[PDB]
DNA sequence: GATCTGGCCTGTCTTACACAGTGATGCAAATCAAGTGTGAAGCCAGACAAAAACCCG
DNA sequence: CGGGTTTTTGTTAAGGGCTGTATCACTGTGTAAGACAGGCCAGATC
DNA sequence: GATCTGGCCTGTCTTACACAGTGATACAGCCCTTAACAAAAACCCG
DNA sequence: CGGGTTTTTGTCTGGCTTCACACTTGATTTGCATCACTGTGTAAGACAGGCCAGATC
């Protein structure tokens, strides 16, 4: 309900005085349950030592700078960043979903004294926020932009005997209610230096725990967990920026295949997914070393677009609204072309196409009774 | 499709309006504890336990 | 506590589902309770006739301009004035 | 400061109030008929509004007292001996005299005869003051009194502004060193 | 007689300043964790007789 | 294995009272889209 | 050979358009009183 | 106006349950005041354009 503490205490004491008995609970037990539910409360362990990661398990929010010296004689930086510990937030999410996964296991013809190794599919995502500053002193002061890095659990499975059984499947993972956040930064999305400096420890811990075994207590029985991470909650801009590709410019535009715009326009269905992460690393190494001594454009075409060093392995995907609007735009364009009898006209003028679009919009507003607009949407 | 089996329908203001609400309603000054508080509240808001206790009116 | 209608209904239904009993009140009961306190509800009278004042006794919020002359051929004005009636407000305060 | 719209909005309320001034309400709140009278007192008006809705000039008039007709020059000579010589009816009379001008006198003499009344009053106000303004005025006067007594001006007929600023700085430093107080031109309570 | 110049008047930003908020602490104080152990109340079974108000002869 | 006997729910009649969501005029407000001013050329001309 | 110009990129920069939140209104589901029939079940003796 | 009819009011004897001090002390939470730290509406406060009259070749 987005309630503060003073007014909550006021309502609490008012209800306690009116009803006589105590029905609500004061801020003491509330904060107690809060700090109990927050990450970094219950113990856990890992069979591998988890190198480069401490073994302390009673810490929560920490500075996102990761001990970055920001004194006068260093690189200027003032973006305040806060973060959780990846393992801590992960075990906290697992603990708060323990009840749901136990209910699912009981429903799926399974007992309670079961051991792992459970398999948890965890997806990661991060995106900016835009203006988050309500400046009212003198008006628009600064376009302060923020960013959040988060994760989400959407699949929990267990393999017993021969086959497996999905004891937990998220009903709607594309929602704003199961987006467990890791870190928050007051940095621009275009600021590559600060973003990389803040996201490097998270990626380090991720790569460290990618091949580990979690051991946790749920109901008095030790349970073993393994995790499979998937980067698929990034838009095409962030994928193209992080994976070392160029901007939205030159002919190299596909993120799943190494084709070009001209090759795609010539051969439409003649491509398959080939852009991996190790391939991009090798292409960047070739770009940096240039073991053939070729011209700029020669090696640029040889590396096929990539010109920067990627640092986050991602699994690209595609959105439904985008794949629908990309086809609707071409349908609208081919309709505009076909309502002008262009197969007979050798040339095409701007006034001709303008009048054709005007006639099309007029007929549409007359028949279907809608409002045409050049701003294409979904 | 063969890799995942679901193209999905993920899409906005849900990341900015909620953040500004948490920052304006319950947060501190000095830009030091403000982020800690908003992160704690955002973590508490997406808890399956709290949501399960909330939506219990359907059954 | 500066509570909106939607959030109050959410809290009400949540408490009713987690407790079983209806400890709080629904929205229509709250609307009746707030209408029973707004001006222009309880009857009253005046010993003098109070000329230039209407005798209707079930009016609340009214336009503060009191029959303005907002036509285009008149002095321009861009204001939004909302007011209670003086006798109605006094009767409400007394009740 | 928008006078015409404020008057157009507040005229019905003033009419209702002046019509209710001499009425008798009858209610049935306690199960039995109860009669009610009313006495209105408009004392919740600040200086900026009581110098505008009453007809007097806003801030440029020599007349400063909202109760007496003493000018600024006569106020510095006569300190305590005064009386309240202002009301709504006399203000209406003075405005009518200003508008008619039956004596056919100059503008300055007519202005000092109407005691600064230029606009027509339409709200019977009862002005009042608070302790905050009184104490801040007394302290602002005593500050300059301390400056004048520490500068030794009773023996120096004409001093300089820079010398007075030096006096002010010395007094501020002495006060901050002994009493440990932070001086500031922006004065408050 | 024709401009030139110092001193008020007044609508201007301009700028400091106390207050309201958010959150968390942090000591003084009322209450409770169990141990009996009485000890004073509340109602019920057994069948037999006193105040107070309204209608009828 | 299957009826007998017994112990619990549904059904539509209807104008009500009561309670839970869905919507409706209202604006505000975040956000990619696609246009446009330059930047940077390679070709035509004196 | 030096200078002017049309065309391809490129980094902003305004926008319309899809939503977001709110108090009041409007639909839209649950009990009520006879009741003779319509069903579900648990347990038991044949 | 006096008497009758309810209606409420009590009775002891013997017999059930049922909450409360009484310390016992020493943790627990309960509550109100205090702490850290800024954003902002508001009132003091100069401030220069404008309006003047006093003045010199
Ligand atoms: Mg994005
Ligand atoms: Zn492709
Ligand atoms: Zn005076």
mmCIF file of N, CA and C in Angstrom, chain D residues 4-84:
data_model
loop_
_atom_site.group_PDB
_atom_site.id
_atom_site.type_symbol
_atom_site.label_atom_id
_atom_site.label_comp_id
_atom_site.label_asym_id
_atom_site.label_seq_id
_atom_site.Cartn_x
_atom_site.Cartn_y
_atom_site.Cartn_z
ATOM 1 N N UNK D 4 -10.113 42.324 -9.194
ATOM 2 C CA UNK D 4 -11.455 42.207 -9.757
ATOM 3 C C UNK D 4 -12.015 40.797 -9.592
ATOM 4 N N UNK D 5 -11.214 39.773 -9.892
ATOM 5 C CA UNK D 5 -11.695 38.401 -9.747
ATOM 6 C C UNK D 5 -11.944 38.058 -8.284
ATOM 7 N N UNK D 6 -11.060 38.510 -7.392
ATOM 8 C CA UNK D 6 -11.259 38.268 -5.967
ATOM 9 C C UNK D 6 -12.554 38.901 -5.479
ATOM 10 N N UNK D 7 -12.834 40.135 -5.907
ATOM 11 C CA UNK D 7 -14.079 40.789 -5.515
ATOM 12 C C UNK D 7 -15.286 40.054 -6.081
ATOM 13 N N UNK D 8 -15.215 39.660 -7.356
ATOM 14 C CA UNK D 8 -16.335 38.958 -7.976
ATOM 15 C C UNK D 8 -16.604 37.620 -7.304
ATOM 16 N N UNK D 9 -15.567 36.977 -6.767
ATOM 17 C CA UNK D 9 -15.765 35.689 -6.112
ATOM 18 C C UNK D 9 -16.247 35.873 -4.676
ATOM 19 N N UNK D 10 -15.743 36.889 -3.976
ATOM 20 C CA UNK D 10 -16.056 37.063 -2.564
ATOM 21 C C UNK D 10 -17.310 37.892 -2.310
ATOM 22 N N UNK D 11 -17.881 38.524 -3.334
ATOM 23 C CA UNK D 11 -19.102 39.297 -3.117
ATOM 24 C C UNK D 11 -20.285 38.457 -2.642
ATOM 25 N N UNK D 12 -20.567 37.264 -3.188
ATOM 26 C CA UNK D 12 -21.695 36.487 -2.644
ATOM 27 C C UNK D 12 -21.497 36.080 -1.195
ATOM 28 N N UNK D 13 -20.272 35.719 -0.810
ATOM 29 C CA UNK D 13 -20.017 35.339 0.575
ATOM 30 C C UNK D 13 -20.201 36.524 1.515
ATOM 31 N N UNK D 14 -19.734 37.707 1.111
ATOM 32 C CA UNK D 14 -19.921 38.897 1.934
ATOM 33 C C UNK D 14 -21.400 39.244 2.045
ATOM 34 N N UNK D 15 -22.150 39.085 0.950
ATOM 35 C CA UNK D 15 -23.586 39.334 1.002
ATOM 36 C C UNK D 15 -24.278 38.369 1.957
ATOM 37 N N UNK D 16 -23.936 37.081 1.877
ATOM 38 C CA UNK D 16 -24.515 36.102 2.791
ATOM 39 C C UNK D 16 -24.167 36.426 4.237
ATOM 40 N N UNK D 17 -22.926 36.850 4.488
ATOM 41 C CA UNK D 17 -22.514 37.159 5.853
ATOM 42 C C UNK D 17 -23.259 38.374 6.396
ATOM 43 N N UNK D 18 -23.386 39.432 5.589
ATOM 44 C CA UNK D 18 -24.081 40.625 6.061
ATOM 45 C C UNK D 18 -25.581 40.387 6.184
ATOM 46 N N UNK D 19 -26.126 39.428 5.432
ATOM 47 C CA UNK D 19 -27.532 39.079 5.599
ATOM 48 C C UNK D 19 -27.755 38.182 6.808
ATOM 49 N N UNK D 20 -26.758 37.374 7.171
ATOM 50 C CA UNK D 20 -26.860 36.492 8.323
ATOM 51 C C UNK D 20 -26.515 37.186 9.634
ATOM 52 N N UNK D 21 -25.829 38.330 9.574
ATOM 53 C CA UNK D 21 -25.475 39.096 10.768
ATOM 54 C C UNK D 21 -26.658 39.332 11.701
ATOM 55 N N UNK D 22 -27.860 39.465 11.146
ATOM 56 C CA UNK D 22 -29.053 39.813 11.913
ATOM 57 C C UNK D 22 -30.156 38.787 11.686
ATOM 58 N N UNK D 23 -29.808 37.508 11.793
ATOM 59 C CA UNK D 23 -30.761 36.421 11.629
ATOM 60 C C UNK D 23 -30.736 35.518 12.857
ATOM 61 N N UNK D 24 -31.616 34.516 12.850
ATOM 62 C CA UNK D 24 -31.758 33.586 13.969
ATOM 63 C C UNK D 24 -31.909 32.177 13.412
ATOM 64 N N UNK D 25 -30.888 31.345 13.598
ATOM 65 C CA UNK D 25 -30.945 29.971 13.122
ATOM 66 C C UNK D 25 -31.726 29.107 14.104
ATOM 67 N N UNK D 26 -32.469 28.142 13.568
ATOM 68 C CA UNK D 26 -33.201 27.172 14.369
ATOM 69 C C UNK D 26 -32.847 25.775 13.883
ATOM 70 N N UNK D 27 -32.382 24.937 14.807
ATOM 71 C CA UNK D 27 -31.887 23.606 14.495
ATOM 72 C C UNK D 27 -32.529 22.591 15.433
ATOM 73 N N UNK D 28 -32.437 21.319 15.053
ATOM 74 C CA UNK D 28 -32.997 20.206 15.817
ATOM 75 C C UNK D 28 -31.923 19.153 16.071
ATOM 76 N N UNK D 29 -30.757 19.599 16.542
ATOM 77 C CA UNK D 29 -29.636 18.682 16.720
ATOM 78 C C UNK D 29 -29.773 17.851 17.991
ATOM 79 N N UNK D 30 -30.204 18.463 19.090
ATOM 80 C CA UNK D 30 -30.305 17.750 20.348
ATOM 81 C C UNK D 30 -31.705 17.263 20.657
ATOM 82 N N UNK D 31 -32.450 16.876 19.622
ATOM 83 C CA UNK D 31 -33.812 16.416 19.784
ATOM 84 C C UNK D 31 -34.825 17.487 20.114
ATOM 85 N N UNK D 32 -34.388 18.684 20.490
ATOM 86 C CA UNK D 32 -35.290 19.783 20.825
ATOM 87 C C UNK D 32 -34.864 21.013 20.030
ATOM 88 N N UNK D 33 -35.775 21.939 19.733
ATOM 89 C CA UNK D 33 -35.395 23.127 18.957
ATOM 90 C C UNK D 33 -34.368 23.974 19.695
ATOM 91 N N UNK D 34 -33.323 24.372 18.972
ATOM 92 C CA UNK D 34 -32.254 25.200 19.509
ATOM 93 C C UNK D 34 -32.068 26.411 18.610
ATOM 94 N N UNK D 35 -31.988 27.590 19.219
ATOM 95 C CA UNK D 35 -31.795 28.838 18.498
ATOM 96 C C UNK D 35 -30.334 29.265 18.557
ATOM 97 N N UNK D 36 -29.882 29.902 17.480
ATOM 98 C CA UNK D 36 -28.481 30.265 17.310
ATOM 99 C C UNK D 36 -28.379 31.679 16.761
ATOM 100 N N UNK D 37 -27.499 32.474 17.363
ATOM 101 C CA UNK D 37 -27.069 33.758 16.835
ATOM 102 C C UNK D 37 -25.620 33.650 16.377
ATOM 103 N N UNK D 38 -25.130 34.712 15.742
ATOM 104 C CA UNK D 38 -23.772 34.698 15.219
ATOM 105 C C UNK D 38 -23.163 36.088 15.317
ATOM 106 N N UNK D 39 -21.860 36.120 15.589
ATOM 107 C CA UNK D 39 -21.076 37.351 15.621
ATOM 108 C C UNK D 39 -19.787 37.090 14.854
ATOM 109 N N UNK D 40 -19.592 37.802 13.750
ATOM 110 C CA UNK D 40 -18.460 37.575 12.864
ATOM 111 C C UNK D 40 -17.354 38.583 13.143
ATOM 112 N N UNK D 41 -16.112 38.102 13.128
ATOM 113 C CA UNK D 41 -14.938 38.940 13.364
ATOM 114 C C UNK D 41 -13.857 38.527 12.375
ATOM 115 N N UNK D 42 -13.553 39.405 11.423
ATOM 116 C CA UNK D 42 -12.536 39.125 10.430
ATOM 117 C C UNK D 42 -11.141 39.515 10.875
ATOM 118 N N UNK D 43 -10.566 38.743 11.797
ATOM 119 C CA UNK D 43 -9.245 39.035 12.336
ATOM 120 C C UNK D 43 -8.138 38.200 11.708
ATOM 121 N N UNK D 44 -8.475 37.236 10.854
ATOM 122 C CA UNK D 44 -7.470 36.389 10.241
ATOM 123 C C UNK D 44 -6.956 36.909 8.916
ATOM 124 N N UNK D 45 -6.626 38.197 8.862
ATOM 125 C CA UNK D 45 -6.107 38.834 7.660
ATOM 126 C C UNK D 45 -4.713 39.375 7.940
ATOM 127 N N UNK D 46 -3.767 39.059 7.060
ATOM 128 C CA UNK D 46 -2.411 39.564 7.193
ATOM 129 C C UNK D 46 -2.347 41.021 6.738
ATOM 130 N N UNK D 47 -1.163 41.623 6.873
ATOM 131 C CA UNK D 47 -1.013 43.039 6.550
ATOM 132 C C UNK D 47 -1.178 43.293 5.056
ATOM 133 N N UNK D 48 -0.632 42.408 4.219
ATOM 134 C CA UNK D 48 -0.679 42.620 2.775
ATOM 135 C C UNK D 48 -2.114 42.633 2.263
ATOM 136 N N UNK D 49 -2.988 41.826 2.862
ATOM 137 C CA UNK D 49 -4.381 41.781 2.441
ATOM 138 C C UNK D 49 -5.240 42.817 3.149
ATOM 139 N N UNK D 50 -4.909 43.164 4.396
ATOM 140 C CA UNK D 50 -5.680 44.182 5.100
ATOM 141 C C UNK D 50 -5.349 45.577 4.591
ATOM 142 N N UNK D 51 -4.214 45.747 3.918
ATOM 143 C CA UNK D 51 -3.884 47.011 3.274
ATOM 144 C C UNK D 51 -4.383 47.085 1.839
ATOM 145 N N UNK D 52 -5.079 46.060 1.365
ATOM 146 C CA UNK D 52 -5.633 46.030 0.019
ATOM 147 C C UNK D 52 -7.148 45.943 0.002
ATOM 148 N N UNK D 53 -7.737 45.085 0.841
ATOM 149 C CA UNK D 53 -9.191 44.950 0.890
ATOM 150 C C UNK D 53 -9.860 46.085 1.646
ATOM 151 N N UNK D 54 -9.095 46.889 2.382
ATOM 152 C CA UNK D 54 -9.648 47.974 3.178
ATOM 153 C C UNK D 54 -9.678 49.303 2.433
ATOM 154 N N UNK D 55 -8.937 49.430 1.332
ATOM 155 C CA UNK D 55 -8.929 50.629 0.525
ATOM 156 C C UNK D 55 -7.667 51.455 0.640
ATOM 157 N N UNK D 56 -6.863 51.232 1.677
ATOM 158 C CA UNK D 56 -5.629 51.979 1.849
ATOM 159 C C UNK D 56 -4.605 51.556 0.795
ATOM 160 N N UNK D 57 -3.532 52.336 0.689
ATOM 161 C CA UNK D 57 -2.453 51.989 -0.218
ATOM 162 C C UNK D 57 -1.700 50.769 0.306
ATOM 163 N N UNK D 58 -1.038 50.066 -0.613
ATOM 164 C CA UNK D 58 -0.399 48.802 -0.260
ATOM 165 C C UNK D 58 0.829 49.023 0.616
ATOM 166 N N UNK D 59 1.838 49.721 0.092
ATOM 167 C CA UNK D 59 3.067 49.925 0.853
ATOM 168 C C UNK D 59 3.684 51.308 0.719
ATOM 169 N N UNK D 60 3.292 52.113 -0.265
ATOM 170 C CA UNK D 60 3.921 53.389 -0.521
ATOM 171 C C UNK D 60 3.321 54.572 0.197
ATOM 172 N N UNK D 61 2.303 54.358 1.025
ATOM 173 C CA UNK D 61 1.684 55.459 1.746
ATOM 174 C C UNK D 61 2.516 55.841 2.964
ATOM 175 N N UNK D 62 2.467 57.127 3.311
ATOM 176 C CA UNK D 62 3.142 57.591 4.519
ATOM 177 C C UNK D 62 2.438 57.051 5.756
ATOM 178 N N UNK D 63 1.122 56.872 5.675
ATOM 179 C CA UNK D 63 0.357 56.329 6.790
ATOM 180 C C UNK D 63 0.676 54.849 6.961
ATOM 181 N N UNK D 64 1.151 54.477 8.148
ATOM 182 C CA UNK D 64 1.550 53.107 8.415
ATOM 183 C C UNK D 64 0.620 52.400 9.397
ATOM 184 N N UNK D 65 0.080 53.102 10.389
ATOM 185 C CA UNK D 65 -0.786 52.462 11.369
ATOM 186 C C UNK D 65 -2.144 52.150 10.757
ATOM 187 N N UNK D 66 -2.552 50.886 10.843
ATOM 188 C CA UNK D 66 -3.862 50.468 10.360
ATOM 189 C C UNK D 66 -4.980 50.772 11.347
ATOM 190 N N UNK D 67 -4.680 51.462 12.442
ATOM 191 C CA UNK D 67 -5.671 51.847 13.439
ATOM 192 C C UNK D 67 -5.737 53.348 13.662
ATOM 193 N N UNK D 68 -4.609 54.044 13.573
ATOM 194 C CA UNK D 68 -4.550 55.486 13.735
ATOM 195 C C UNK D 68 -4.157 56.147 12.421
ATOM 196 N N UNK D 69 -4.470 57.440 12.314
ATOM 197 C CA UNK D 69 -4.171 58.227 11.123
ATOM 198 C C UNK D 69 -2.845 58.970 11.230
ATOM 199 N N UNK D 70 -1.899 58.447 12.007
ATOM 200 C CA UNK D 70 -0.620 59.113 12.205
ATOM 201 C C UNK D 70 0.313 58.825 11.034
ATOM 202 N N UNK D 71 0.933 59.876 10.504
ATOM 203 C CA UNK D 71 1.883 59.717 9.416
ATOM 204 C C UNK D 71 3.188 59.113 9.933
ATOM 205 N N UNK D 72 4.069 58.767 8.993
ATOM 206 C CA UNK D 72 5.371 58.225 9.368
ATOM 207 C C UNK D 72 6.211 59.263 10.101
ATOM 208 N N UNK D 73 6.093 60.534 9.710
ATOM 209 C CA UNK D 73 6.874 61.581 10.359
ATOM 210 C C UNK D 73 6.387 61.837 11.780
ATOM 211 N N UNK D 74 5.068 61.891 11.976
ATOM 212 C CA UNK D 74 4.535 62.133 13.313
ATOM 213 C C UNK D 74 4.689 60.913 14.210
ATOM 214 N N UNK D 75 4.814 59.721 13.622
ATOM 215 C CA UNK D 75 4.990 58.517 14.427
ATOM 216 C C UNK D 75 6.351 58.489 15.109
ATOM 217 N N UNK D 76 7.384 59.024 14.455
ATOM 218 C CA UNK D 76 8.709 59.059 15.062
ATOM 219 C C UNK D 76 8.786 60.042 16.222
ATOM 220 N N UNK D 77 7.876 61.013 16.284
ATOM 221 C CA UNK D 77 7.854 61.977 17.377
ATOM 222 C C UNK D 77 6.927 61.535 18.504
ATOM 223 N N UNK D 78 5.680 61.206 18.176
ATOM 224 C CA UNK D 78 4.715 60.713 19.154
ATOM 225 C C UNK D 78 4.799 59.191 19.175
ATOM 226 N N UNK D 79 5.226 58.632 20.307
ATOM 227 C CA UNK D 79 5.483 57.198 20.401
ATOM 228 C C UNK D 79 4.257 56.417 20.869
ATOM 229 N N UNK D 80 3.739 56.745 22.051
ATOM 230 C CA UNK D 80 2.730 55.934 22.713
ATOM 231 C C UNK D 80 1.349 56.580 22.655
ATOM 232 N N UNK D 81 1.276 57.908 22.714
ATOM 233 C CA UNK D 81 -0.012 58.585 22.791
ATOM 234 C C UNK D 81 -0.748 58.535 21.459
ATOM 235 N N UNK D 82 -1.606 57.531 21.285
ATOM 236 C CA UNK D 82 -2.394 57.376 20.070
ATOM 237 C C UNK D 82 -3.721 56.722 20.431
ATOM 238 N N UNK D 83 -4.583 56.571 19.427
ATOM 239 C CA UNK D 83 -5.881 55.939 19.619
ATOM 240 C C UNK D 83 -6.351 55.370 18.290
ATOM 241 N N UNK D 84 -7.262 54.405 18.373
ATOM 242 C CA UNK D 84 -7.824 53.770 17.185
ATOM 243 C C UNK D 84 -8.884 54.703 16.607
#
